[PDB]
Amino acid sequence: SRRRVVITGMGMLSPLGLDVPSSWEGILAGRSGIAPIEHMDLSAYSTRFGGSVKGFNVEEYLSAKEARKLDLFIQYGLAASFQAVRDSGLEVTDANRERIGVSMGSGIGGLTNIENNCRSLFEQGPRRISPFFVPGSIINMVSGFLSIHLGLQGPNYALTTAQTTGTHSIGMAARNIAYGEADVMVAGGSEMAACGLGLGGFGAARALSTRNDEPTRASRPWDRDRDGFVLSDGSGALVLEELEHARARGARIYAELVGFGMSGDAFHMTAPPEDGAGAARCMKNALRDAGLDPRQVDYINAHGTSTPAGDIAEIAAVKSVFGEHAHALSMSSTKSMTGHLLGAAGAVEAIFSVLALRDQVAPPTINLDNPDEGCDLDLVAHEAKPRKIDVALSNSFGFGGTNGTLVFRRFA
Amino acid sequence: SRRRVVITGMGMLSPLGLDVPSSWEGILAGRSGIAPIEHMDLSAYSTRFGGSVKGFNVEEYLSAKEARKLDLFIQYGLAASFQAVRDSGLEVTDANRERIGVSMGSGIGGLTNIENNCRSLFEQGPRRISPFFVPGSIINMVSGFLSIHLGLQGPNYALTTAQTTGTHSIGMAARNIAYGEADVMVAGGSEMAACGLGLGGFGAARALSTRNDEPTRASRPWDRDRDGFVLSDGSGALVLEELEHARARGARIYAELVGFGMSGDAFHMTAPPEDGAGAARCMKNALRDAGLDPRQVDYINAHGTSTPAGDIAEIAAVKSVFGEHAHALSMSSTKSMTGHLLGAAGAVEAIFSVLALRDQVAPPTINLDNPDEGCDLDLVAHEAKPRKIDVALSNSFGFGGTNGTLVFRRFA
Numbered sequence: 010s011r012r013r014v015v016i017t018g019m020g021m022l023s024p025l026g027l028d029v030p031s032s033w034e035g036i037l038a039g040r041s042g043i044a045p046i047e048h049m050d051l052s053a054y055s056t057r058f059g060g061s062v063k064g065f066n067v068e069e070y071l072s073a074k075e076a077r078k079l080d081l082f083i084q085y086g087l088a089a090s091f092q093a094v095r096d097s098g099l100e101v102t103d104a105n106r107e108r109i110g111v112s113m114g115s116g117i118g119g120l121t122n123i124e125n126n127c128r129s130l131f132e133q134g135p136r137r138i139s140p141f142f143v144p145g146s147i148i149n150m151v152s153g154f155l156s157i158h159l160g161l162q163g164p165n166y167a168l169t170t171a172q173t174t175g176t177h178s179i180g181m182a183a184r185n186i187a188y189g190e191a192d193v194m195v196a197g198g199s200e201m202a203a204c205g206l207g208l209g210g211f212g213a214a215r216a217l218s219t220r221n222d223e224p225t226r227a228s229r230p231w232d233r234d235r236d237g238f239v240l241s242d243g244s245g246a247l248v249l250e251e252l253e254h255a256r257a258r259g260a261r262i263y264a265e266l267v268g269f270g271m272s273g274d275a276f277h278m279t280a281p282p283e284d285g286a287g288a289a290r291c292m293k294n295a296l297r298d299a300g301l302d303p304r305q306v307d308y309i310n311a312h313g314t315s316t317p318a319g320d321i322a323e324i325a326a327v328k329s330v331f332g333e334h335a336h337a338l339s340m341s342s343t344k345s346m347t348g349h350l351l352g353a354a355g356a357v358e359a360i361f362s363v364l365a366l367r368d369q370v371a372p373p374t375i376n377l378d379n380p381d382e383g384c385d386l387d388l389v390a391h392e393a394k395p396r397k398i399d400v401a402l403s404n405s406f407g408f409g410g411t412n413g414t415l416v417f418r419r420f421a
Numbered sequence: 422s423r424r425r426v427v428i429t430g431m432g433m434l435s436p437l438g439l440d441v442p443s444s445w446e447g448i449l450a451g452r453s454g455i456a457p458i459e460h461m462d463l464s465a466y467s468t469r470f471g472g473s474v475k476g477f478n479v480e481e482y483l484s485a486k487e488a489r490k491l492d493l494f495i496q497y498g499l500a501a502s503f504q505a506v507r508d509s510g511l512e513v514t515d516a517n518r519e520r521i522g523v524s525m526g527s528g529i530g531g532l533t534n535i536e537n538n539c540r541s542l543f544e545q546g547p548r549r550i551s552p553f554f555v556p557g558s559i560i561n562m563v564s565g566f567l568s569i570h571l572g573l574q575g576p577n578y579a580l581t582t583a584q585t586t587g588t589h590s591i592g593m594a595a596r597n598i599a600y601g602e603a604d605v606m607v608a609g610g611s612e613m614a615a616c617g618l619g620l621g622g623f624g625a626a627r628a629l630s631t632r633n634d635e636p637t638r639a640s641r642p643w644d645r646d647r648d649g650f651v652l653s654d655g656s657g658a659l660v661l662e663e664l665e666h667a668r669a670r671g672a673r674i675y676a677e678l679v680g681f682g683m684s685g686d687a688f689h690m691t692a693p694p695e696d697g698a699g700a701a702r703c704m705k706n707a708l709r710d711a712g713l714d715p716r717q718v719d720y721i722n723a724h725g726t727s728t729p730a731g732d733i734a735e736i737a738a739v740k741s742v743f744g745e746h747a748h749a750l751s752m753s754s755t756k757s758m759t760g761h762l763l764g765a766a767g768a769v770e771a772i773f774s775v776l777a778l779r780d781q782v783a784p785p786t787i788n789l790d791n792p793d794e795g796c797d798l799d800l801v802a803h804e805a806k807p808r809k810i811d812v813a814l815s816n817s818f819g820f821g822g823t824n825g826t827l828v829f830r831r832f833a
C-alpha cells in the first residue's frame with residue numbers, strides 16, 4: 010500500500026544564486042536575476058536578455074576533464090543534484106544503492122552543444138563532430154552521470170514535458186517511492202536553452218518579452234503591460250525519501266509531498282485555454298490525491314510566465330478550483346524574479362514552495378504595478394508576505410497542453 | 422493491490438513496413454530493412470546505410486499544413502499512435518476522456534528539424550527560424566498532438582531514456598493503469614536521427630557498423646564479426662488498457678503486460694559492464710514484479726544491438742538470471758533485421774514480443790554465421806523457430822546505464 014514521501018535535500022542553480030540559500034535570499038528580497046546576455050552577440054535577435062547563472066564554477070563539482078564533455082544543462086543538473094544529495098546527509102552503500110534512483114529532466118537538453126556541433130558539421134564536416142556529442146547532449150545524461158558518480162542503481166530515467174518537466178519529474182519520482190519501486194529518488198530538472206536556436210526559436214513564435222531596454226521589468230506576471238516570458242537557465246534537484254526510511258536514519262525533513270496531479274488540456278499545441286480548464290482539472294486531481302479540502306491551500310507558486318493568455322488562464326483556474334477561498338490564499342510567480350527556467354521551472358519552484366513552508370512567507374510577484382482585468386487575487390505584489398502556510402501548491406503548464414501540480418505541507 | 426494491464430492495440434512504422442502486420446511478416450521471413458541512405462550525401466561519413474522508413478505518406482494521418490509543422494520523429498510517432506488507437510477499437514467519450522493518457526517518447530526528437538534550422542540560422546540569422554520550430558521539434562509533442570487530436574485528458578508526458586525510451590514509456594504507462602491513475606494509455610516511442618548530427622554523432626564515437634559494402638549483413642548480433650549498431654528510424658505505439666475495461670467493451674486482447682523492471686548500471690556513460698550486472702538486476706526486478714520464476718520465461722527479445730560489449734553483456738546477464746534454464750529459453754535480436762530504432766527500439770520490440778506470444782514463434786537473429794566466444798545460447802540463428810511461448814521478455818539497455826525490461830504473458 011502507498012507510502013508517504015518527504016523532502017530531505019534540495020539543490021539549485023538559478024539567476025539569483027549558485028545554491029538554494031543564496032537564491033532564496035534574492036526571492037525574499039524581490040531581487041531580479043534578469044540581465045542582458047553577455048555570452049553571445051544577440052544584436053540580430055528581438056530579445057537580448059534573460060536569467061543567466063552568474064559565476065557557475067563547474068570545478069566545485071567535476072574535473073575539468075569530465076566537464077569539457079558535458080553540455081551546460083548537464084553540468085547545472087549535476088551541480089543541483091550533488092547539492093541536494095549532500096544537503097540530505099544520505100550515505101549510499103551496497104545495502105541501499107539498488108533502492109536509490111534519479112529522475113532529472115530537461116525540455117531540450119544540450120541545445121548549445123547541438124548548435125556548436127551543427128556549426129562544426131556545416132563549416133568543417135562530420136569528422137569534426139565531438140565523440141562526446143551524443144552522451145554529452147541527450148536529456149537522460151543528468152540521470153546517467155549522477156548514477157555513475159554516486160553509484161545509484163535504482164530507477165534511472167528522464168522526463169521531457171517542456172515547461173512542465175520539473176514538476177512531472179518530482180511527482181513521478183514521488184510515485185516511484187509511494188508504490189515501493191524506490192526508497193530514495195533525486196528528481197527535478199535543468200535547462201540551458203540560451204543559445205541562438207533557443208532565443209531565435211522562441212523569438213520566431215513571439216513568446217518572449219522584447220523589453221531589452223529594461224530587462225529587470227520584463228517579467229511582470231498578471232501586469233497589464235506584460236509581453237511574454239523571460240528565458241532563464243539553471244537547475245533544481247530534491248531528494249525525495251520514503252517517510253519511515255527518513256525517520257529511521259534521523260533525516261531533517263523539510264516538508265511532505267502529499268499531492269500530485271497531471272492532466273492534458275487537449276486544447277492547443279502552445280496556447281492554454283482562456284478558462285484554465287486543464288489547469289483546474291490538474292489542481293483538483295492533486296488536491297484529491299492529497300486528501301485535502303481546497304480551503305487548506307494557503308500558498309500557490311503559480312506557473313505565472315508573464316504571457317498574456319497563460320497568466321489570465323491561471324487566475325480563472327484558481328477561481329474555478331477554490332471559489333471564495335481564492336481570495337484568502339496567496340498566489341505569486343517567482344518567475345517575476347528568476348524568469349522562466351523552462352524544464353527546470355517546476356524544480357526551482359517546488360524548492361521555493363518548500364521554503365515558503367519552512368519560513369512561513371509568500372514570495373512576491375515583483376513588477377506587478379497594474380494588475381490586469383480580473384487579476385484581483387492576493388498576488389503578493391512587490392514585497393514578500395509573512396503568513397501562515399500549512400499547504401503549498403506548485404503549478405506548471407507546457408506545450409502539448411501538459412499540466413502538473415505538486416502539493417506540499419508542513420511535517421512535524 | 423494492483424489492476425491488470427492488457428494490450429488491445431498496436432501501431433508501427435519500421436524499416437520493414439508501414440504497419441505491424443507487414444513489419445512482422447518481414448521479421449518472420451528474416452528480411453533486412455537496411456540499405457544505403459538516399460537523398461542525403463554521406464560521402465564524408467564512415468557509415469552510409471541504415472534502416473529508413475520507406476514510402477511513408479503523412480497525409481494518411483495529417484493535412485500537409487499540420488505535417489509541415491512537425492519533425493519526422495513526431496509524424497512517425499503520430500502514425501504509430503493513430504494505428505494503435507484504430508487497432509484497439511477504443512471509443513473516446515466525455516465519460517472516459519479524463520481516463521485516457523499518452524506517453525510517447527524519443528531519444529533525441531527533432532534533430533533533423535534542429536539541423537535544418539541551424540542551416541537557416543548560420544546562413545541568414547534568426548529571422549528565418551520557423552515560428553513552429555520549438556513545438557515542432559520537442560519530444561513531448563507526440564503526446565501533445567495525439568492528446569489534442571483525440572481529446573485525451575489523462576496523464577500526458579514523454580520519456581527520454583536514450584535507447585531505453587520505448588521500454589520505459591510502455592512500462593511507466595502500464596504502472597499509471599495498474600495504480601488507477603488512468604484506464605487507457607497510448608505508449609511507445611519514435612525516432613528519426615538519420616541526419617548529419619545523428620550519423621555523424623554516433624560515427625564520431627565509432628559506435629556504428631561501417632560495413633558499407635553489405636548493409637544487410639552489418640547488423641549481426643553475437644556474431645564474431647559484428648562492428649557496431651545500425652541506425653534505424655520508425656515508431657511503435659501500444660494501447661494499454663485495464664483488464665475489466667477491455668473485457669466490458671469486448672476488446673480483442675493481444676497479451677497481458679505482467680512485469681516491468683528498471684535498473685541503473687551506475688557503470689559507464691555508453692558501455693555496459695562485461696558481466697551485465699545491470700541488465701541482470703533489471704530482468705530479476707521485472708520477474709519479481711510479475712511474481713514469476715525465471716524458469717517460466719520462454720522467449721527474450723534481446724537489446725542485441727550488434728556492439729562488441731553490449732551483445733556479450735546480455736549473454737552474461739541471461740546466464741546469471743536464468744542459470745540451468747538459460748539454454749531452454751529462446752533469445753533473438755530483431756535488430757539483426759530492423760537495426761536499432763534507438764528510442765523506438767523498445768516500442769517495436771514490445772510489439773514483436775506480443776506477436777511472438779500470439780503466433781507461438783521466436784523471430785530469427787539473422788547474420789549469426791559465427792557465434793562469438795560464450796554466445797552458445799539458443800539465439801534463433803538465421804530462421805524463425807515455432808515453439809511454446811507463455812512468457813516473453815523485452816530488454817532495453819541505454820546510454821547512462823539505463824535498463825528496462827517488460828514481461829508479457831499469453832492471455833485467456
Ligand SMILES: C1CN(Cc2nc(C3CC3)no2)CCO1
Pocket residue numbers: 116117120170171172202206207208210211351352408535554555556558559
Ligand atoms: C521547454 C524549453 N524547451 C527549450 C527549447 N527547445 C528549443 C528548440 C530546439 C527546439 N528552444 O528552446 C522547449 C520546450 O519547453
Ligand SMILES: C1CN(Cc2nc(C3CC3)no2)CCO1
Pocket residue numbers: 123142143144146147528529530532582583584614618619622623763764819820
Ligand atoms: C538513443 C538515440 N539518442 C538520440 C540521439 N542524439 C543524437 C545526437 C544529437 C546528439 N543522435 O541520436 C542518443 C542515444 O539514445
